[PDB]
Amino acid sequence: KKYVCVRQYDLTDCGAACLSSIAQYYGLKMSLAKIREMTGTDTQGTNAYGLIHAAKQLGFSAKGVKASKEDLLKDFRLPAIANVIVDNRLAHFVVIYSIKNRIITVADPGKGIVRYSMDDFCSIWTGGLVLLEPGEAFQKGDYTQNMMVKFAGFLKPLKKTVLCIFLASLLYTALGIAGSFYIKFLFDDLIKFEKLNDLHIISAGFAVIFLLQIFLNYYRSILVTKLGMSIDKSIMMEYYSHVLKLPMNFFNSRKVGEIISRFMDASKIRQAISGATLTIMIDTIMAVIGGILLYIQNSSLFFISFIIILLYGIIVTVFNKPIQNANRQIMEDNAKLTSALVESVKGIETIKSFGAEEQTEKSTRDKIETVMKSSFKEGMLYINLSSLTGIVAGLGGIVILWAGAYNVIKGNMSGGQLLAFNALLAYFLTPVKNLIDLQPLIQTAVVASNRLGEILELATEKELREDSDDFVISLKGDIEFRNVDFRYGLRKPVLKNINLTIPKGKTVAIVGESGSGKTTLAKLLMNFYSPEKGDILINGHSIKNISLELIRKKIAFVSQDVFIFSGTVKENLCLGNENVDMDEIIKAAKMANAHDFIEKLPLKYDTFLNESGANLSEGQKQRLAIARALLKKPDILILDEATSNLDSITENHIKDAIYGLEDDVTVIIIAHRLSTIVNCDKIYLLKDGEIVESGSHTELIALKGCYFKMWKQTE
Template sequence: MENIHEEEQLNKAYDSKLMKRLLSYAKPYWKLLTISIILLIFVTLTDLARPYIIKIAIDNHISAINEPMYVYDLNESPVDGIEFDGKEYVRKSRLEDIDNSFNNIQLSTLIKYKNKYYLVNGNITDDFNDISITNNDINTNIIINNNTYSATRLTDEEYSQFREEDVSNLNKLALIYLSIIFIGFVFNYTQTYILNYAGKKIIYNIREEVFTHIQKMSLTFFDNNPVGRLVTRVANDTEKLNEMYTEVLISFFKDVFMLIGIIIIMLQMNLKLALMSFTVIPFIVIASIIFRIQIRKVYRLIRVKLAKINSTLNENITGMQTVHIFAKENKKFREFDNINKSYFNTTKKEVKIFALFRPSIEIIRSLGIALIIYYGGGRTISGAIEFGVLYAFINYLQRFFQPIMELTQKFNILQSAMASSERIFQILDKTEDIKNIKNAKNLKKFNGKIEFKNVWFAYDNKNWVLKNVSFTINPGESIAFVGATGAGKSSIINLINRFYDIQKGKILIDGIDIKTIDKYSLRKRIGIVLQDVFLFTGDIKENIRLNKENISLNDIKYAAKHVNADNFIEKLPKKYDEPVMERGSTLSSGQRQLLAFARALVYDPDILVLDEATSNIDTETEVLIQDALLKLIKGRTSIAVAHRLSTIQHSDKIIVLHKGEVKEIGTHQELLDKEGIYYDLYRLQYKENFDIENSKL
């Protein structure tokens, strides 16, 4: 037999139909998502701009001390330059784009030697491996690599004059850099807020839809699905979809924008160095594919085992009283421990895969950086590549690997979302077993006549629980069903409320087939008091009112007093505002039962159903309930299911069921006179009293 706690496996890593369906939930928020994507473009641009600004600062200003300068007479330079000693000096790089011939123009170069600065007449392109100064006078000759140049030693103030523009531009670049950081922060904050708002709204709508759909399902659905599994669907699985909408759907664009932007900038700065940097990409792709395959297998197991933990937890916590009664704590702990260990061992596999993948990517990234330093560093020393370009390449390469790693992680989230969405849609795609027909009758009032005509019913469509059952209950009658366990008493109650649909026959209320009545209006007019009363977390008054706002506190107090529930409510510290714990654990069985009677009365049903409502009640409380029952059933049709025959002796009619069939119908005395099944049940239940009564006769 299939374990009810086991989860189904996901067959596909990506399903386009599922994705299309998921995207349909995002459609109402397309404007917000579009704004988020646009903001992502600006966020990406601010991220890409920062290394480039530092590159400009290094190459154009910090390292520009050694760049040759054209020397012009004052006011003859095509651009504004640095005025010094009756001349104007313009850096060579500033004139590269001007159509002019500079072959006959003198060049000068600033150099630093032993913490002193010199203005050398000439283009110094060689490395300063061999340098000497012939004298320290103002007119100085400098020998560099066996080449002699005339030079002028500069004071600190004069040197600052040459660097004044650099300092000014560096200050501007610093302000631009800070501005970009601030603007990037604003864009990023706005984008994150908008994206998460849209994502949360989407998940909110999905959760609402799933919960609403679950509420519509018949009891058969809940018979086949453990509560833990449904909780996993509404809570855990929808949260996985939230990760997909916020971290995959939109953030995917940022990773793509970042990769494209980095590639364009690197190719533009230096083609050879860029192509060399990209040689590590195939290794990244191979590592990512291996990771994706392995993590998908592990993730499937994790989802299965997590759902099993939720189901088992719910089952054991709900049945904790039974566990304590039979001292099965150790046994249940061992069962949970085995499930928990299995989940733990599976998560360890996930950790191992991540622990191997991330360092692998880090190694590949380090190799790429080492390759740039090896090749680019040599080219920088030779002057073929500027130092700022080398710095920018290393920075961009480090950034280049981050989107790749995140894209791999996003695939894992996508895989998770696919699994969750498939399971969510499996619930949403389950059609309601109990449906309202088109133009179903919405009845506001019942007279209370109930007819079963040749009714056949089975929970599994195989084993008949009711067989050709026929009876009539007239308006205002008090009817009781009796019979051995499994005779079909509770099934009749479930069918009257249309919690299940019959396979054959008809069930009529006031001559109308209940399948043609709106099921919600049907259930509103039928009040049920069950043997196991379910109370919700809240307070006394809300458990009677059940959030029906048009029921006033006076109505609640009247109903409670009418069924004798006010006897214990008024003794509570906060009375009708007294907190109720989960399932009413702080109240006795009798108190919960009295609250159930008050709940039924305040809704003023036309038909009242009591399903073993007095089976767990002590004698003192039973007296109160019997008094309440007489008040409840007055003026309305009432149906009672009871094992204790003493509680139904005064019923207008008793229907005896045996193995799903109606065997006897009559009053208490009529059935005793028949000496049939009811006679045997009564004799067995009250043997001593029965013998005394017979002896008197």
């Protein structure tokens, strides 16, 4: 059976790519992003437990077993997934297909199908074998929609522009044919007879056609530029609008550059969407008519031209793949030197302190030499390709003239038609050359469309959420966390079974160890994630029972790592909601202790916060976060690290402000230091993902439990 491998779209897709390769070898074809969600892939990497779990829930019967040189006994099933190390640099996943004569075929998502021998492979992979068997529930079928037509459908409301471009190109070719034939009329009638008047008339009448050709080229350029800009803008709008609706697990699982690169990928998709279609559509017919005209001129010369373009196509086809291989290798080796430079510059203080200058300058030189070697390999390939193409083109040009002169010597055609044939050779060779050179563009574009359109098939938050706006008015009452178990992925459960009760109008202080889960609990409180079992009860109604928009609007969370957006401070304090008076901003600043330093700024409230507000101090950023939090007058106020920085009286001001609400709104404070949380009605002390002590300060002090022990630790 045919061996199939799937190239990884990004870096950390080894497990998903291997699983997709197994599926497409056994028959199933699923979308790659869905498989990534199934496998629980994270930024650091993919655990084999997640891969096995995804295989089992997919329908495979999979097992992860150890192996030590036991790949010779017949007791095994193929293909099978293995883990390798790249000369002790970083882990990777490959899949072995068949071993025989101590020589093995393995698919590596990094490169493709790659040969290995027993000794080197055994010296590469340390240990581990994932065995997969098709189960009874395994159903073969295809689940991926062709996304190329999905992205090409944007051309449906733009038929007028492409029709005009096609007509202009047709007129361009028609006018160019006469310009090509001009030299034949010159050398056949206007020279052999000394008719100067006809020379003046014809030379002037065959020059305006070139001006019309230039005008057509101008019109084509304008139309193509407008079409390309429109398509790029539309694709970017769709992609960004869909990404902003994706759930939080998508953002947590991936990096930033992975999301950003799809913006540049829009141009690569558009190159096929706009350029390729028009190019092939006009060039096919123009090449056909040029070849027909050439056949009308002569047969042997047309055959010679066909032979030459055949050799050109063969050479391009045979040399195409090494070009991509070398380009990928250069892109891999020059992404390691740039990391060393940034790392060296960022840690220049330690480098100077320990005096590791010679080591650094020696290490960087080796990477630069490797980059230069890869670039020289690519240059070698390019020089070989260019030399062969030039040899073919020159030999064809010399052979054409020789054959034409020979035919004129016998006299199978007029002498002047050879020049016309040479002129038409450009019009015949350019379109077929473009068609031959279009293939790598098509391959890159289809890979790009598979990579980018993969995201658009994901499910947003609105679809997952049900409806609860029919009855809900606000988020007041008593909060129950009942049997809430949550996993931060496919790892050990960070949060355990809890019976948590937050009463009406009570200040709650959640305290625990640094490695314990406190911010995560607040995250589930606003429903950024979904618990696997258990429920969150508000007024006797579950999480499935509270409308999303209400949860977002009525809950204010101050993050541990505050983020200040670029722009005016006014836009920062009141974002999301508009039509708010300045009085609310003023009082938010007053109880946030922000009016004191904001007045010192050059502008009262129109000051522009550049570089994401890096000029302002951390305490000022905290004050801005607090002002934004109470600007929205939410039902649930969850503070995380507001008291991180204080001037020994600012915490007193903020505590007075929290005490000054005169409403039953609930405030939950995550606390690291214990002196801040005093005179608190309810305190929940958590160890090992479990709240142990539930009560006010006095009785739990009298209880003689871990709470007082932590005090014996902080004091």
